[PDB]
Design a protein around this nucleic acid. Sequence first.
RNA 1: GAGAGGAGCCUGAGAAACGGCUACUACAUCCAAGGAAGGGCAGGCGCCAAAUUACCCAAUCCCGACACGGGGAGGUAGUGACAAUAAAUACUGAUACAGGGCUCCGGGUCUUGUAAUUGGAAUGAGUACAAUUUAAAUCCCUUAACGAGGAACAAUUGGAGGGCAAGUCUGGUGCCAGCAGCCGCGGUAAUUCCCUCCAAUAGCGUAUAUU
Lengths: 94, 227, 54, 74, 49
Amino acid sequence: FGGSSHAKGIVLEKVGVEAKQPNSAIRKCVRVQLIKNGKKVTAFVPNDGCLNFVDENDEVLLAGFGRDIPGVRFKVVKVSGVGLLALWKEKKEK
Amino acid sequence: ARLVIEGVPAEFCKNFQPRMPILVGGLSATEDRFGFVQVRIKRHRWHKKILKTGDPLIFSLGWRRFQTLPIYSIWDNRTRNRMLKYTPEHMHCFGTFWGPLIAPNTSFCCFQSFSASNPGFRIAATGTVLSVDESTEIVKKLKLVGTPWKIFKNTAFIKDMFNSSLEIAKFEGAAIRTVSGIRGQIKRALSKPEGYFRATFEDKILLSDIVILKAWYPVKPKQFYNP
Amino acid sequence: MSSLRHAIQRRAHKERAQPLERQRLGILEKKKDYRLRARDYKKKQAVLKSLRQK
Amino acid sequence: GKRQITWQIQKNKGLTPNRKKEQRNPRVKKRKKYEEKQKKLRSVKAVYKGGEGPGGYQGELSGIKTNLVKSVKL
Amino acid sequence: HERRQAKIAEQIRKLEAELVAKRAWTLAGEATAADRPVNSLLGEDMEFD
RNA sequence: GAGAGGAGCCUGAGAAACGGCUACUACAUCCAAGGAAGGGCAGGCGCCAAAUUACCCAAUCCCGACACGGGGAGGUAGUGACAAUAAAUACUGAUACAGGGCUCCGGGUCUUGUAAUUGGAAUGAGUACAAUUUAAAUCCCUUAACGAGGAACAAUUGGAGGGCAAGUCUGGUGCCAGCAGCCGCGGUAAUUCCCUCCAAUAGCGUAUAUU
């Protein structure tokens, strides 16, 4: 993940939706099937409200970080073409 | 191809117009089974009202359009789906109603009226269908409330809460609470002032305090369905 | 984050007063008044404990 | 008899952070920022602000302090 | 059918009569011994600490 | 410089003219199945979508029985935050009330504020009569008239920090602490409640390569 800057992906399993803490990293991370690589990497959805928008099977664009689980490395930026922060705000539908 | 169908009423026969189109929508057996549907409601961004639970709705799911009544409820810290009374503004709750079953990830639309006279944005709620079941497990907090009658140091005889020693004995080990954040335990039914009892607390409470029991009464959604 | 928090997610929640019957009895202690009488009583009993040991 | 579209529909503000009327204009915002940081430099250092005014030295207003040596050793 | 929308219309009348009418003490989320009947706490089933 | 394709042919002042004939070679269209007519670049998708299917020969110029008839040169306009340029979203008083405001454990400074009450001017975005510019329109240049009181003519993008429930979850030698909280008893024509600071500012954030 140094050749391209954004990678597409399939949301595979919302990992840890049964957690107790509302904005912990367990609830934030989501399992992702990378399309071109074929690997499965988990990525931080930046809110539990945004986790309510990240659905199953959907095409989801991810990016990196830069700086509760230090080591999960990617970041969900879009869900089905629409940006996830524009979904978090009431800007656009999907 | 041609499709012949027996049993079509004289509303569609005697009121047919080619302006309104005709669908041939393909059900499955799952789409033919009634039951309870667990559903991820978000209100629409440009619906102006908020959506009460007991108020009926008109649904766009599958191939058909309902008028059934949901129960909005937040899976609040993932131990209970506690029953809300309104849809949260700008947030995804878990609605649940009685209709036909559909497979999950079925995104769906939601309406309060089929009337042209709505001055703005008829769409009520949008979302995805979460799962399906019968016999929901939606929970609403019932509080039983009462007044300190006599105040000793850690014990307190409290009143106006239970009606009888039978009810005290049913709740005779219960965690009772004072809104000062003061826990306590129902110990034993006080004999002659029937309905009052003895509790103990972690510290001394006041007569100004008010003593609550935070129980969780179960809620069944109503069935009624019509297209 | 604090930037990832709305403005309805920062609304102050309203403390509820007493019923009008109990308005005779006084202020509903909620957590603040409880902590004031609890720390005051702890201070009193700490001083009385030191004096009993004297 | 056409359904008029409303204003949030036309401009999807959605859920934006509530901002200030002083933030609405950047020139007003730097005007109200310079007035405050002109004010704070009065509190720290000594500004001239004219000599004796009309009345002609009603004494050292705002006191005189005798121990204090406000000077740079050289 | 007019039979189906007739019986369904009756059930609409019963339900919206219930939406107009009062709220039972188990659903009014703070019940007390003045509010409820006598041994009516006994028959129900709740979950408490 | 070479041009459905070899092979030949014809016109003219100038062509081995092919978007002209004659066979042969490779396909392919109308048919009443004998016969016939047939041999371009541009457009969209492509090796989840982003620049008009615009108006004219009016200028300048070219060709014909020739002042008229013809012009895929050229001109006029439309989109465009990739840039680059100028700069709106306000200016100015008066009084009333408050006594602290600010800055580095104790210091240092002296006028500061108000979701306080009122008063003034200023209008430019825009709406737009006209006329003009033009092949015709438009932009421009003029331009009468309307055109500001916040709940509006409704500035954004990032970050940092505070406060909060009869709510929730977790830990544990009561009353503490944690993470957090659109979710609270009722109530949806129900409610009228809580923000501060920093940065760039019609622009700004983010990811990787990085220098």
